[PDB]
Write a protein that binds this DNA or RNA. Structure first.
Ligand SMILES: [Mg+2]
Ligand SMILES: [Mg+2]
Ligand SMILES: [Mg+2]
Ligand SMILES: [Mg+2]
Ligand SMILES: [Mg+2]
Ligand SMILES: [Mg+2]
Ligand SMILES: [Mg+2]
Ligand SMILES: [Mg+2]
Ligand SMILES: [Mg+2]
Ligand SMILES: [Mg+2]
Ligand SMILES: [Mg+2]
Ligand SMILES: [Mg+2]
Ligand SMILES: [Mg+2]
Ligand SMILES: [Mg+2]
Ligand SMILES: [Mg+2]
Ligand SMILES: [Mg+2]
Ligand SMILES: [Mg+2]
Ligand SMILES: [Mg+2]
Ligand SMILES: [Mg+2]
Ligand SMILES: [Zn+2]
Lengths: 84, 51, 54, 116, 177
RNA sequence: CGCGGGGUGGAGCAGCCUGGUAGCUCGUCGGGCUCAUAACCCGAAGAUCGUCGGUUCAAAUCCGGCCCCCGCAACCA
RNA sequence: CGACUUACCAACCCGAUGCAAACUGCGAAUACCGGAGAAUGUUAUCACGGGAGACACACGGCGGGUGCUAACGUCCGUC
RNA sequence: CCUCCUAAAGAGUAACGGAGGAGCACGAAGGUUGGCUAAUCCUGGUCGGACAUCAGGAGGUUAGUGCAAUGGCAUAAGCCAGCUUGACUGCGAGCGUGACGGCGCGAGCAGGUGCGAAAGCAGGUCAUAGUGAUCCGGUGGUUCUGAAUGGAAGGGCCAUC
RNA sequence: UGCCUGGCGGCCGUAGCGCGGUGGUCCCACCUGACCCCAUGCCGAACUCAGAAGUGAAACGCCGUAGCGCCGAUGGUAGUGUGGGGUCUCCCCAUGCGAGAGUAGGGAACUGCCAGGCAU
């Protein structure tokens, strides 16, 4: 009861945050090849003029303005590039 | 780890070689592939060799 | 320090209005006495409520 | 169901074409008739349509459900597309195995002039 | 196709008159006949499964499919993908041929045959019956039977209910009891 | 209290570190030799692995705790 | 070889109740990103270059972890 | 180093805070074309049962995803089969993310290939872990240099240990 | 123009499920038969081919049904930005935003293009 006892912990591990999430939001004007959203799995899908990379990163394939819309029978979320 | 490293040398006589990893024990048979050879700019047979 | 502690007891956070104990099949006055006896063992102010249609 | 399986089969190539923006020559094969349509990339406008169900095509055919009826209808749809200046389309087999009547229609259209 | 002709000419009439079906197409048919044998002993000697499949091929005139494990089971010491049975599906012409052969030859050769159960309709109209011995089929030569391979036979039918299914089967002079 | 281990027939130990199955000795039982016993000889059975819960198709084994048994440490003022 | 009950334990489903940081078929306020529009602000913005210091923080309010919903405790976010 | 929470609905965010994993695997588990759809339970059925294979139904993805957890996935990224080497060479608009070293995404262009009738897809795997800078050296190309000249030694550049 | 049917969509449950009924001139489906083209890790089941006797049985289409699923106000409540206040680990006031659930209720989709059939 003098000083203290002791006892190690088994946790204290974690990983570098990956900076996911929407980079360019709706209404923004992107250059071709701009990343619109980095994500894990197609949480967002590739609409018009939008390409999906291997890590499911959505990048604009044409110059223009971003546009999110709920589309399809599963009410999924599609990112499209309106021509500008 | 358990996989060793091998180089696939060109059979076109360029001396060019790709490199890759192979499981020696489970696939003892050598590995042959048609891979592009930049030196002769043609797809040619590449066969396995030690690194 | 040196980590978290060990679990010692389990509680149930109580917010005002939560109906803790319910009772049926007894007279109202005896229910009041029983609930008084029970509330005497709890660290929260209580009150006696009845059933209503809505 | 057979048609449910067919729709599930078709949907992938249909979506690929729909995003690519190709004018679509969609076929539809039944045990008796074989239909062909050419449809705008938006999907809601029927450019041309040739089918064995209609007299102009059927009256030159013995049976409307075989490779020769398919060749006739493919020839007709390709010529009407060339008269509308459609020129360049892409083939939507709608899940049907590209073989037999569907393939015969495709070759008839290709020789008549539709490019796919 | 003898029993197929018998079906289309007499069994259809019986069923129409009996169940008052409004459409002729409402009368039950025989969709398929599946002959299975679960060679659970293949896990020790794989060759046993090949020989059992040879016996089934002899019975059916039709090379069998080697059905494998759907999921690994340790209670029977089978891993996923281990072949543990062989099956054949018979339709149409060979359907009817095997069906007639069974009814009019193999069932009589059953040792101590008293009558097939009428309780083996799986609630819809499918008849599943178990044959203990492959010697009841003359297609198998007795003298080379290294081992008593059984099998089980499933007559799959377009009947909605067991009543209609068994009426259809009995109209084929099927030996119930 | 921390850290390293251990829990396996009736007793003492292996096995387990490389998940696909539990052995050795003594003991116990039955018979045999002996007038009888001991020793001895010949046969047999016996534990489902501390325990809970997971993982896995499969747990004595891997894992997490829990219970008990040893060992080291629990210091500087 | 062959069958009864109960004293009880209780799965699924149906209905009625609650709870959750590692639960969500719902879901704000704020904050954030982008665009346009006035006014205001000694360009308050960005780039480049010369010189630095600083990298021991403290308390208070709001949202929290840890602690005993203890500490002028400790570790965070934002003022 | 990877995953979830704390983390306060953009990003980021600490603790000797709460939970788990990695130091790989695969020549196919990659590419493409064609095809297919799960768990579980109930009913019937030779050995054979609670759990083996067969048939039907209910169910609805409660399955699967080579390995952790999350996010995904029916057009399947899940399961078979054919042919295969794009698990290519030189670049790369534009972005994202970092103090920096660096790391990631990437249409498109050139060459030459695979699959498909074709549109088209393919410069690895459903994604996020599977790893170490520099120096010093080793191996193979490269006549770039090669101390008087011609070579060579050595050094450089490219691939790689 | 009307109505039925087939195809391609729009949209993604006010659109799905259940239950009851109804349709075969046309369409569609079941169907008939496999030198064939093509095919099953066996099977003309499926894919495919040559057809058309029969039936709308199943499926599909349509119609009617509220038993569900679904949508859903007004009001109140919770939370909350800014500024204050309290016996302050929680609250209250002024002002701005204002749900979720639930209630009334709605609800058996609607709609474009082309083709065919019938009555015109
Ligand atoms: Mg930390
Ligand atoms: Mg939450
Ligand atoms: Mg410092
Ligand atoms: Mg500091
Ligand atoms: Mg500090
Ligand atoms: Mg600080
Ligand atoms: Mg503060
Ligand atoms: Mg909170
Ligand atoms: Mg605080
Ligand atoms: Mg302090
Ligand atoms: Mg301090
Ligand atoms: Mg955040
Ligand atoms: Mg925030
Ligand atoms: Mg893979
Ligand atoms: Mg793949
Ligand atoms: Mg993976
Ligand atoms: Mg010299
Ligand atoms: Mg040199
Ligand atoms: Mg509401
Ligand atoms: Zn006789």
């Amino acid at each position: 009861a003098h000083k203290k006892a002791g006892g190690s912990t088994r946790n204290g591990r974690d990983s570098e945050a990956k900076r996911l999430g929407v980079k360019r939001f709706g209404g923004e004007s992107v250059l071709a090849g701009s990343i619109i959203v980095r994500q894990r799995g197609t949480k967002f899908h590739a609409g018009a003029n939008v390409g999906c990379g291997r890590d499911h990163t959505l990048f604009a394939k044409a110059d223009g303005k971003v546009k999110f819309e709920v589309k399809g029978p599963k009410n999924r979320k599609f990112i499209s590039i309106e021509a500008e | 780890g358990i996989r060793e490293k091998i180089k696939l040398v060109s059979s076109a006589g360029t001396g060019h070689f790709y490199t890759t990893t192979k499981n020696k024990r489970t696939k003892p048979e050598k590995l042959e592939l048609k891979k592009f050879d930049p030196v002769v700019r043609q797809h040619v047979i590449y066969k396995e060799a030690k690194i | 320090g040196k980590g978290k502690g060990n679990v010692e007891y389990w509680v149930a956070l109580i917010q005002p209005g939560k109906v803790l104990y319910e009772m049926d099949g007894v007279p109202e006055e005896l229910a009041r006495e029983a609930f008084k006896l029970a509330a005497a063992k709890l660290p929260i102010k209580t009150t006696f409520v009845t059933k209503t249609v809505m | 169901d057979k048609k449910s399986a067919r729709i599930r089969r078709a949907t992938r190539a249909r979506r690929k074409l729909q995003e690519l923006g190709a004018t679509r020559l969609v076929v539809h094969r039944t045990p008796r008739h074989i239909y062909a349509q050419v449809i705008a990339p938006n999907g809601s406008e029927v450019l041309v349509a040739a089918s064995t169900v209609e007299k102009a095509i059927a009256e030159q055919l013995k049976y409307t459900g075989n490779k020769d009826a398919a060749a006739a209808v493919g020839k007709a749809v390709a010529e009407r597309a060339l008269e509308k200046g459609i020129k360049d389309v892409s083939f939507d087999r709608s899940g049907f195995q590209y073989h037999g009547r569907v393939q015969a229609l495709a070759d008839a259209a290709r020789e008549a002039g539709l490019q796919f | 196709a003898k029993l197929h002709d018998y079906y289309k000419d007499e069994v259809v009439k019986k069923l129409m008159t009996e169940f008052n079906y409004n459409s002729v197409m409402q009368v039950p048919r025989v969709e398929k006949i599946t002959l299975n044998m679960g060679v659970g002993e293949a896990i020790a000697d794989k060759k046993l499964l090949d020989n059992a499949a040879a016996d089934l091929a002899a019975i059916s005139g039709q090379k069998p499919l080697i059905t494998k494990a759907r999921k690994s089971v340790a209670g029977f010491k089978i891993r996923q993908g281990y072949p543990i049975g062989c099956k054949v599906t018979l339709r149409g012409e060979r359907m009817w041929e095997f069906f007639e052969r069974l009814i009019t030859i193999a069932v009589p050769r059953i040792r101590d045959f008293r009558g097939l159960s009428a309780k083996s309709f799986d609630g819809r109209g499918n008849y599943s019956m178990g044959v203990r011995e492959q010697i009841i089929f003359p297609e198998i030569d007795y003298d080379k039977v290294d081992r008593v391979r059984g099998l089980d036979i499933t007559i799959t039918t377009t009947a909605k209910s067991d009543e209609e299914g068994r009426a259809l089967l009995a109209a084929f002079d099927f030996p119930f009891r």
